[PDB]
Symmetry: D2
Amino acid sequence: MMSKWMQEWSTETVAPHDLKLAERPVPEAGEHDIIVRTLAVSLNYRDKLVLETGMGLDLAFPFVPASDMSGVVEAVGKSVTRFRPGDRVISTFAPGWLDGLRPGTGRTPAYETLGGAHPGVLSEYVVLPEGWFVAAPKSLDAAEASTLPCAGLTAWFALVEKGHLRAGDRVVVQGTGGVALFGLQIAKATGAEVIVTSSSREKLDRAFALGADHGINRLEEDWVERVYALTGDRGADHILEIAGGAGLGQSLKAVAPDGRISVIGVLEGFEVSGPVGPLLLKSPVVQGISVGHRRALEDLVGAVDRLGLKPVIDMRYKFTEVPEALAHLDRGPFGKVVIEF
Amino acid sequence: MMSKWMQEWSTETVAPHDLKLAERPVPEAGEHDIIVRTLAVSLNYRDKLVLETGMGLDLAFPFVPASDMSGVVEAVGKSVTRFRPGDRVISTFAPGWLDGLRPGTGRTPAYETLGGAHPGVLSEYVVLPEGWFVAAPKSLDAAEASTLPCAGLTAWFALVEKGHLRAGDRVVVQGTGGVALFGLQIAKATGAEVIVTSSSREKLDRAFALGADHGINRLEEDWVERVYALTGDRGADHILEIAGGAGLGQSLKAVAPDGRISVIGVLEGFEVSGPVGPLLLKSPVVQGISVGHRRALEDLVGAVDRLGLKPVIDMRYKFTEVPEALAHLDRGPFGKVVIEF
Amino acid sequence: MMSKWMQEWSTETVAPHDLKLAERPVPEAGEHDIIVRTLAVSLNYRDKLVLETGMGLDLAFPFVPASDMSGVVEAVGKSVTRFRPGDRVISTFAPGWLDGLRPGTGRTPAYETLGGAHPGVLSEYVVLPEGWFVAAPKSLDAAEASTLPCAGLTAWFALVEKGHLRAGDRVVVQGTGGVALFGLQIAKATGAEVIVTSSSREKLDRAFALGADHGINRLEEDWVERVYALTGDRGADHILEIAGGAGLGQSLKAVAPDGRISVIGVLEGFEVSGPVGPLLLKSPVVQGISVGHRRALEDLVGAVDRLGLKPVIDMRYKFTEVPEALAHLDRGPFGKVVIEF
Amino acid sequence: MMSKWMQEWSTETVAPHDLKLAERPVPEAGEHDIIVRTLAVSLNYRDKLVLETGMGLDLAFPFVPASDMSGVVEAVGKSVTRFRPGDRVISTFAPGWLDGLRPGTGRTPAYETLGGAHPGVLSEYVVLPEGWFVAAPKSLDAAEASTLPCAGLTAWFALVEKGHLRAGDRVVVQGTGGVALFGLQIAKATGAEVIVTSSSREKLDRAFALGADHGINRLEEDWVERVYALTGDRGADHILEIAGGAGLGQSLKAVAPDGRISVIGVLEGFEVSGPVGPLLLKSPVVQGISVGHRRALEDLVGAVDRLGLKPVIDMRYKFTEVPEALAHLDRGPFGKVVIEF
C-alpha cells in the first residue's frame, strides 16, 4: 500500500518564520485530486520573501513554502482524466490561470500561487487538483523538471509568448539567476544573440560556456555603452530587466527603437525610475511579466523536449538540507537551487 | 502668377526666442517639392519649448516654429505625383516616417520633425517634399484639418494602431488638452466608455458636453478609487497618461490586469515613477507614444471623414496674433489653439 | 421546494429525427452543478442539421437539441461559487473552452458543444457544471440574452477578438442571418461602415433600419463592383463570409490588400473555392471562425450592456411550438429564432 | 573611367519571347539614382512566367527579366545618401514597399516589381533609385546574396514577420525549391523542427543534410497521416504551402488547431480547394504571402549575417548561359539558380 504519514517543511509563523520538519497524515484525495510523490523541488526567490516578510498574503498555517516540483503520480481520484498512476508531472505556479487573460482585478491584481495563497510543495506527497499539474518533460530528470514552472516559464513567457523573439534579435539578459539563464537558453535556441551583464567575471565565464555571445562586467564598464558598441548603435531588441536595480532608466537607453523591455521581479514596494526621453522617442514596449499560464507551460515542456534544453542548476540539496538551500538563495546562485527527495 | 514675397514668424535665436514677423522670397520648388498656401496652423505645446529651451535640437536660423498645418497646393514640381494644384493637404509631423518601424537608433532616438530639425510651417506658403503631405479630410475646414498631424495622430496611434481598442472598453483620459480630447472622441467613436480626469469643474462640464461618460475632479477625490467604483474594480482597459497629468504610479494602480497605459509626453527631463507590484502582478503593457507615421495619418483622415468627427478647437487666432496664441498655449487650452490664415 | 418532473423536446434517433415532447425527472445536481430554470432558447441552424444528419456526432439518446439558453439559477451544488440562486445566466456554446488556444487535435478538430457531444438545453430546467454558464447581460430580457452564446459570440469573435476592427473600417456582411446582424451591430458600435449583401429588398430595407450604411442586392448587381465603387476601389477592411452567401473567391476580389476575411459556416461538406491571385497579391488573412471561448463571451456581455445593444429577433415561439420554430429556422430568419419559456 | 556600353539579356516580345544579348549605352544616373555593377542574379520562377505568358503586365520593351541581384556600387548621384561607391548591395523585389501596408487597391492588388512593371536586373549595370537597394550581407558572396530579395524574404516574411515562428514549433515545408529551402533554414535557426515533403528520395537525402528533421516522400506515403504520426496527432504549427498543387485541402487536414498555413506561389489563375471542416473547426489562419518589404529584407540580411546562414544554390551559370539557366528553371531545382557575372 501507500504509507500513512508524510514529512513536510512547515512553519507556524512568518516574518519571522520558524520553518522545520513536521510529520502529518497523508491527506485524502478528493474526486478530482491526484496524489504525487515528490521527487524534486526548485526554490524561487519569492519563497524567501514569503517566509521572511509574509508578502501581504493570507496564509493557512502550518504553511509549506515553494511552488515548483516534479514528481510521480501515486493515486488519482474517481474522476481524474488528466493522469494515471506512474505519470511524471510538474506543478503549475498559478493554478487558476490556464490560458489567455491574467486573473485578478484592477484593485487586487495578485493572483493566487502555490506556496502562498495555495499550499506549497515542500513535502513528500502533494495532493492537489488534476488541473494543477502538467505532464513533465520526457527528456529531463526530476530535478531539472522542477525548475520550469516558475523561472523557465517566466523567461519563456517574456520572450516568446509576449515577446515573439526572432532569430537575429539581440537580447540582453540582466544577471545570472534562474530567469536570466533560461532566457539565455531560450534566446539562443531561437537564434538570437545574447548579451549577459554581471558584476562577476567568474559568472560571465560560466555564461560564456552556456553559449552567451557577450558578457559585460557592469562594475568594470558602462554596459549601455557596450550594448551600443555590440549592436552598431542599434540597441537591444529585447531586455530581460530583472531586479530593476540595474534598472529601467538604463534599459531605456539600451533598448532599440520599437524594442521590448520585460520587467521581472517580485519586490513588493520597489520603485522603478526612467527618463521619459527614450520612452517617448524610441517608443518601446515596457511590459510587466510574472510567470505564465499552463498552456504556456505545456508549450515550454514540448520545446524543452524537442530542443534538448538542460536547466542550469547551481546545486542540488538533500531534503533534510532545506535550511542550507534557502541560505544559498540569498548568496546569488548561478541558475537554480533544487531540492532532491 | 504667384506672389514673390511671403511672411513668416521666425527667430534668429532660441533660449530665449525673439520671434518677430519677417518677409522673404517664396522659395523655389524642386522636382518633388510642392508649394502650399497655408490656410491654418495648429500650435503644439512643443512649439513653446522649442522656442524657449531649443530642446537640444540643431535648428537652422532664421527658424520658423510649428509643424501642423493645412492648405491648398499652389504649384508642384516637374515630377510630383501625390498632389495636383488646388488639392487640399496637411503636413506630416515626422516626415519620412511612412509606416512600420520607427526611425532612430539606440544611442540617438530622436527623429526629425517639422518645426524642429526641419523648417516650421508658421508662414504664408510652405515649400516641402510631396511625401511630407497627405490629402486633407473632405469633411473639415482648414482650421480643423490642421489639428490632426500631431494631436489627432498621437491619440489615433495610441488607442487604435498600437492599442486595438474595442467597443465596450473603459478608457481614462487625463486632462483636456489636444491629445486628451481626440482621445475621448476616438474612444467614443469606437464604442468605449471614456472617463475624463481634470482639476477644473468647467473643463469637466465641457468634456461632458463632448460626451465623456464620467468626469473626475482629481482635486476633489482620489481618482483611482473613482475608476474602481466606475468599473466595479476591474479598473480601466486603456489609460492615456499625458505626462503632466496624474502620474504613472497612479495609472498603474488604476489599470486593469493586462490593460494598457499609453505614455504621452512633453518636457525633455521629466522622470517617471511607479510601484513595481502592479506593473508585475497586473502585467499591463506600458508604451511610450511619440506621435505616429504617415499611413496611420491617412487612416485617421479617412476615419475622421466617415465618422464626421469635429476636432475640438479652443480659439482661432489671426496670423498677426501668433504671440497671443502662444500665450493661450500655456494657459491650458481646452483642445486646440489654431492660427487661421 | 422544487418540481420533481420537467419536460423537454427529445428524440430517440437522428437522420431523420423523431423529436417529441417527453417528461423525465429533474436531474440531480453534483457538487459543482447548478440547476437553471430555462427562460429562453435560441435556435441555431446547426440544431436542424444535428437532428437531420447527426453531423458525425456521438449523441447520447434520448437527445435534446439546442445549445443557447438563458435562465434563472434555482439551486447550486455544495461547492459551486460562480453563481448563487436567483442569478441570471447564459449557456456557453463550447464548454471548457475558457480562453486562448482552442481545444482539439490535427486529426480530430471537432470540439464538444452543447446540443451535440453534450446534452441540449431545450428543456424546462438545465443541470450542468457551473463553468458552462456566464452571467447574463443586465440590459436584456432572457429571449435577448439567449441569442449571444453562438451568434453573438461568432461575430464578436471574428470582428473584435481576432479581427481588431477599428472605427473607420468598411465591413461587408453577407446575408441577414443571426451572425450577419450581430456583425452589423458590433461593426456600427465600433464606428465602422457596414455594407450588407442580400437577395431580398425587404431584408435590405430592414437592414437599413438597423443602420446598415449600404445594402446590395446580389441579384441586381455584381456586389464586388458595388464594394469597389463604395470604397473608392480600396475594397473592404473586413468581410464576414457566411458559408452559404456569395463565395470565397468573390470576397477575395472584394477584400482590401492586407484586409481580413472571416469564414463562418454551416454544412459539414461544403467545399470552398477561390482564385490564387488576389489571395497572394493582396495577402488578406483568411480565418475560419468556430464561435469563440468563454472569456470572449464575458467580454461580449459587458459590451452589450455598456453599448445598449439589442439583439435582432425574428420571432419568439412558445415552448410548445418548437416544431413551428424549427420550420422558421429554415425559411431564412432575419436574425434570431427564440423559444420563450 | 567607366565604360560606355553595357550588355543585357533582352526581349522585344513576350509570350512568346525572344530573349537575347543586346548592347546599349550605360544609362545616366539621376540625382538620386545609384549605378551598380552587377555581380550575381538569382532567377525566380516568375521570370519564366513573365517571359512566357506576359503575366498580364504592361512591359516596357526592350524588356530585361529578373529582379534579384547583388552588385557593387560604381557611382552615386549628387543627392545619394544611402550608399557610396564600393558598397555592396542587393536589390529589392517590391520597390514601392518600404514597410507596413502592402501597396495596391482592392480592385488592383498587383504591386509593381523589378523584372515586370519596373526594369529587370539581367544586365552588366543597373541604374535605379538609391531606395531600391539595401546593403548586402557582410558574410555572403555575390551569388548567395542575390538569392535573398525574393525567396529568402518570402520564407522570412511568412515565417517570422507574419508567422512569429517559435522554438519548438513543427513546420512543414512543401517541396525543395528556393522558398522551401530558405524556410527550412530559417525554421531550424529559430529552433523549430522541420518536415519536408518531396516526390524525390534524392532531394529528401539532400534536405536531410541541410538539417531537416524528417522527410516525407508523398508518392510513397500519405504525408498528412505521417505529419500526424510525427506530431503525436497535434498537427503542424506552420505549413509553407507552395504551389498549392499538393494543396490547401490536405494542408487544412495537417495543420494544428490555431496553426498557420502560408500560401506561396505566383500562378495567375490557379484554383485553391479545401474542405470547410478543418477550416472552421481548427480555425487556422490561412495567409497569402508574396515577398515582403525592405525593412523586412534588412532584418533578414542582419539575421543571415548573425546566423552564418548559407543559401542553397543548385547551380551557378556564366552570364552567356542564361538560356540554360532558364531551362534549369523548369526542371525543378534544389534551391536557387544563380547567374554569375
